[PDB]
Structures are given as C-alpha cells and as structure tokens.
Amino acid sequence: TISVRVTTMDAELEFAIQPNTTGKQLFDQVVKTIGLREVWFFGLQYQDTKGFSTWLKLNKKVTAQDVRKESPLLFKFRAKFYPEDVSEELIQDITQRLFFLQVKEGILNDDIYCPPETAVLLASYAVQSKYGDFNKEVHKSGYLAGDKLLPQRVLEQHKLNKDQWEERIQVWHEEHRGMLREDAVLEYLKIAQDLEMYGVNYFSIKNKKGSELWLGVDALGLNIYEQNDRLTPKIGFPWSEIRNISFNDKKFVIKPIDKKAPDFVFYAPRLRINKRILALCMGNHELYMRRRKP
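The line above is the sequence of Moesin; the predicted structure tokens follow.
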C-alpha cells in the first residue's frame, strides 16, 4: 500500500491505498471521515515534483499524476471556490469551521487587506469562540499574548505596544459574552465575506500594448485591476455574461454573449496559470449556474 496523510485547516488525517485509487475516490475517503457533505467547493492540493502546489485530478490516477515522490505523501484540503453568500449556502458545524480557518489564517498574512476598524471586529469574534465567554479568572493578563490576532500591517500603523492593542481587544471580546462559539464564527465570516479581496484568486496579466496588471477570478465573474488598485476593480464581467473561454499556449479567449460585442482575450506569460485560470473560471461559472438554475 501507500503511506499517505491528509491535512486540513485544523485536522490531520492519515491513510493508505493500493496503486490504483483515483482523485474522486481518494477525495471522497476523507470527506467521508470528516462528515463533510457540501464538498462542491473543496479540493486537494499537493506538492508536485517540479516545485509547485497543485490540485488533484479526481478523474485520474493520482499515480499518473506527478506527486512529489516521497513518503508519506502529503496533501492539503482547501476549499477551492468560495460561496456567494456564506450565510445561506453553508450548513455543517464543520464546513464553516473549515472556511473560517482558511479565511482567517489568510488574513493573518495581509493576504487579504483589512482596515483596522474592521480588523478588530473580526478578531473580536476570532476570539469570542476560542475562549468562548471571557474570564477575569481564566483570561487574566498575557492570555492573548501567545496568539496572533491582527495583521502585522495594522499593528505598524498604530503606536500601540502589543498589550495596548490586546488591552483594546479584551474590551470587545467582553461584549461577545453569551455567544456560542458557533455564530461567533458565522458573524465572523458574514463580516469577512465582504472584504474586498475575499474569495478572489488573483493572476497577473498582459494586454495588447504591453501594460501589466491583475485578473480577478472569483465565484462571481471576473475583474480587471490596475497594478495597485486590487481592492477596487476597473472593469468587470459576470458569469452570466460569458458563453466561452480557453487558451492557445499564451492567449486567453473569453466569448461574450450575442455576437456584436468583440471577443475577450488577454495575455498570461505562463501557461499553468492559464491552465488554472481556466479550471477556475469554469468551476466558478459552472457553480454560478446550478445555483440560479439547479
């Protein structure tokens, strides 16, 4: 058999399979263990040979696939597409604890811009759960010192020593008393889910006349951002307004809907991106559909 191990935002699964197993299968084996049951989001990431992080092929032999040769084998379990409205699409005490971690962890890296004011309300919630209600007896001083709760960026924008900040969080955690470590989260997401960068895979891209910038692919449609205004986009195209897309080596072709509107194409210097940009553009759009017409 094979010596494998599945990794989650919080959980560490281990496994074994004969040299046959495929993605799909494999996939399912974990999603089975973790009682998850809303899987049309998550997927499997792994370290290949070349040196990148990639998404397993459910429909192919993992062997066929070029996993970083070693042992045990190591795989990440990450939600691939995010939901348009968490509140109404997410349902398991687990599915949610599953995004939350991915999301949060991500913010704690400024991988998602987040303004100070709103930076706290989150952490105010990001703790509401971890410690449930506060305790002057349990949560004495230092209690939040062995934790991370704010994006370094925010820290350095204010002349507050670690505790000044902590001192300031305490206060809002207090206010969360009476909250079940469950809605603490939702409320946390319902908060985060509106940040600008939320659930948006990014890609750098080129036009006709050389200019460089960002492609916005996310469970809604697409967005083209200037080199710096990644927050607010400058052009957009929703999954309803696009009939087709694909690439030819380095070209990205997206067909609008009618016949009078030109043909949408841009330029990625790397292919794998296009291979992903597609993969992503698909799923997203596709997901977009069964939603509004099941």
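Note on the example: The chain has three domains: 1-81, 82-197, 198-294. The longest strand covers residues 73-79.
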